[PDB]
């Protein structure tokens, strides 16, 4: 039988190419998607055109909230519902806004930075747990954790905590064959409110050839993570990054 | 005129020593807690028989929740009610406790693990910066963090997101002179809960004198960072641990 | 024409898989070896016998001295005179034995612990790159540099530079198009001098699965690194540990 | 009986800072020196000066060679000569220069760089430690090592050994009560070399005030760890970089 996947925010950009890849890799995938409905419906469609019934949506609002454990308990859920098993977990979907120090109530902003980027994989990995081979958890993570964007606390304590995460559930989940890895892009597709000069700018930045990282080189490193070829891989983060981390000021 | 410093869960253990060292290096202190009104109200005393009117005691629950933000600039307010300035912010406070992946629910453990331990740090940061000399946080971190209390993924998350939070910070209030710093505890006043036989397989850990640190050994650290020998010091992490993070398994 | 790789120590264990694994996938192999003539030579036949001219053997001493620069640049030189290019480098050769800091003198100990795991690693990374497609480097390094064997000083050193030849190189290389990551292993093949019930306490230590990696598991990660879906990591070290270096003491 | 300290380079700029603020202290001081003969004089005579008989000077190469461990071993002697006592060792003399990957040789540079920053250390470290109250050893790091100069592979090697040996030694001198720790400036005291302009460019990329660090402010953070306030620090390494670190490229 194949083996089933659920992408968090997979409508969609890196989310979308991880998808892709793990259902072309054989894998039967839950497209988990926010507003994303359209983008959604149509992977979907794409994906169940290439081999019937291999493919569902899923729609979820990630934000904390005391709802949140029962959210993400029924996406889990659906995979089994769909696909009698979940197989991988691929923590993809997150919120990147500034929140300075110095539009949203910063209550909403807390809410949304530390749940879709924390809390929610969070309570993900507890459900994806208890509901249970080659189990894994993949966390989209952040190369420039140690040197974020400026005026992104919220965001980079988020992603700080994805990093706790990864290692404690790494840990924790050891004893049952769950493995638990990072993936940690440094700049990959841009995002869509970024200009066009400051694009040009983080490219320049990149050394391996002053360019981003397509959303399939991203995919690339999650697929590695979820083979057979990473069974004694597990609390590992790769940065994905061309080495833009290892850029001084 | 004397500085002025909030320190929160100051009435017991380490905030209780550091809170004393602030006020025997001259400053005024707000003494922050939640249920130790006892403790609270004694510890002022002491201070205030030793100078007039130079503490103060503020209550507030830290747990993640819609009401946080308003109570973390209260706390903020506490200080420049009784002392006219805010120059040192101590975030101190915290839930400690497992949660484990496989009689609170998930959602009041997020909340008051990732509450106390970060959220609530980054509405004090938010408030003590907005109502602004040596100005400087410091962040009570873990030492331990990258190799964490099993079944303890949301005390993890949430000192992870504590780092984040002290580098960010740094690097954003830097231009308005506040530094942010850590200090990173291995092994000090050993929880209440554990028991004491617990308690000497711990201190036979620790490399540097097979015993755990004195809540005094913790506020020296914190007393270096807040002082005139600190000045250039910001985004930096002191372990304060003995060796004992160095210790393999 | 099929790629080139250089792998240093490859006569036995971790070396001798990462080679087999290479030679499978399809390069031309040169393996290095310092004392181990007949199982390089043997290794080498049995390539051979797999597929004609696709193995040679090169015989050097890695210890630091002012002859290594020569050592270094000869074992590059075996590739280009055997297989007209070289397209992976392989640092896999190590000393490791204990030195305490309170029979080997001290700077034979420095020569050789520094020297195998560092200097060469350094001379090599230069000697490859003057004379030169997916180009890439793998250093193998450990995931245990932070929590290290007592009284093992040197061997440390030695790792930590490698990590930082790792990133130095990473970053300079880069332009070139010669990626430079790492492997890191926790406990694999169990050093030979270790006694078995010594064997034993480590592989119990390991959460996942209770067992040391199998040198093909470390291989599979030089195999990735090496492979078109690294072709944006550039800088990472990734362990494989099996959550090793999350264990606490 | 005052203490006494050697510090390595400590004729000028941010070793003379370190040996004349442990002269302050109470500490009598050897002053280690290589070339600047003049100016080691110049500050012994200073010292001496102001307190009899508690300064003297200390000639010797630290590059790699395999006499480096008898040099290592006289530095050491020569405290106990003059002062009948060791008390604190800081490692800050350092060799600084480009090492591209693509009139000294490549044997010298390494000699003169790992010798420097690394081996000298680890051989001083291991002659203090047998020679043998508040004894601790401080080593002088570098808190951009994971973002370095362009083409200074050597020099960022020897940096990240001296990590490892900071750490290693911290864990294996710890049962004798010697504390093992580190200083991380990011730009002080800038290179003679430099030209004002490229010195500016690097003012303007550190957050807090723009500006490199003094001499005595590196110097600060070496009193705190070799003082009774850092009795239970070891293994920890206290950047003073005024947040250039967390700066992205
Ligand atoms: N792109 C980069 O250069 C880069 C760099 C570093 C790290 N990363 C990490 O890589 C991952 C993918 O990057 P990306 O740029 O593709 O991500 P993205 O486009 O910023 O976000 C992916 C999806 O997150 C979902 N999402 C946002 N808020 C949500 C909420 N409240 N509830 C549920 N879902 C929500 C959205 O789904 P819908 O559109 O359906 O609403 C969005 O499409 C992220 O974790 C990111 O942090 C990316
Ligand atoms: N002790 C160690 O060995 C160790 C090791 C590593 C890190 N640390 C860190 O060092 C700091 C001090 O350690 P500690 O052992 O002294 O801390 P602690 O006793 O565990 O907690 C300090 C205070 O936190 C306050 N607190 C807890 N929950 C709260 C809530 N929901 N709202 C508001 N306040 C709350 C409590 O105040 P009330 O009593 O008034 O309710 C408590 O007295 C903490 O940040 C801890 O994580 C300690
Ligand atoms: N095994 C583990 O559990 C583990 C754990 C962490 C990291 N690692 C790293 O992974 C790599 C492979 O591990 P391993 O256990 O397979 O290594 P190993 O058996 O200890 O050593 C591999 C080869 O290094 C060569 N070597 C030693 N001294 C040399 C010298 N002076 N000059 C030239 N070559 C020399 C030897 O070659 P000859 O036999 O031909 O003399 C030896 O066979 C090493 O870099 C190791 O540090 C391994
Ligand atoms: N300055 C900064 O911005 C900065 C930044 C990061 C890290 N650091 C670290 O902080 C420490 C002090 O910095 P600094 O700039 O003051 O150092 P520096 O001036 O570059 O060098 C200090 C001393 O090192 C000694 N030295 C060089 N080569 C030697 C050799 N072969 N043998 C013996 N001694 C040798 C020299 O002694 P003589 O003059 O007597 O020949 C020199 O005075 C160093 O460890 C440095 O790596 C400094
Ligand atoms: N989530 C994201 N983190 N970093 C990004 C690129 C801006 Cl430089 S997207
Ligand atoms: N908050 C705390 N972290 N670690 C502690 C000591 C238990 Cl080993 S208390
Ligand atoms: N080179 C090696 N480093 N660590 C090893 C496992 C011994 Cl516990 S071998
Ligand atoms: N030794 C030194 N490392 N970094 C320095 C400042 C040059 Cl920007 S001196």
Redesign the interface.
């Known amino acids: 039988e194949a083996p089933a996947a659920v992408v968090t925010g997979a409508a969609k950009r890196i989310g979308r190419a991880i998808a892709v890849k793990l259902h072309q890799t054989g894998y039967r995938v839950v497209i988990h998607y926010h507003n994303s409905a359209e983008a959604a419906v149509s992977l979907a469609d794409e994906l169940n055109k290439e081999r019937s019934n291999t493919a569902v949506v899923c729609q979820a609002d990630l934000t ?3 709802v ?2 029962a959210s993400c308990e029924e996406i889990i859920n659906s995979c089994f519902r769909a696909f009698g098993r979940c197989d991988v977990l691929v923590n993809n979907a997150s919120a990147f806004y500034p929140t ?3 539009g949203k109530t ?2 909403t902003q ?1 809410a949304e930075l ?1 749940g879709t980027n ?2 929610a994989p ?2 993900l ?2 459900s994806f ?2 509901r249970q081979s080659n189990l894994s958890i993949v966390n989209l993570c952040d190369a ?11 965001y ?10 990864t ?11 769950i ?1 638990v890895n990072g993936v940690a892009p440094g700049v990959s597709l841009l995002p869509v409110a970024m200009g066009e000069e400051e694009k040009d700018k983080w490219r320049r ?1 990149v ?3 002053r360019r981003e ?2 959303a399939e ?1 991203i995919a ?2 999650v ?2 993570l979820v083979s057979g ?8 983060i ?12």
Not at 167 to 177: I, K, T
Not at 240 to 247: N, T
């Open positions: 904390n909230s005391n949140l454990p300075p120090l110095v910063v209550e807390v530390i924390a809390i969070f309570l990995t507890m747990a208890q420039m954790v140690d040197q974020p964007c400026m005026a992104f606390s919220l980079n304590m988020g992603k700080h905590a994805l990093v706790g995460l290692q404690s559930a790494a840990l924790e989940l050891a004893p049952y064959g493995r930045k050394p391996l050839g990282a397509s080189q690339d490193a697929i590695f070829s990473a069974q004694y891989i597990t609390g590992s790769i940065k994905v990054d061309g080495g833009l981390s290892l850029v001084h000021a």
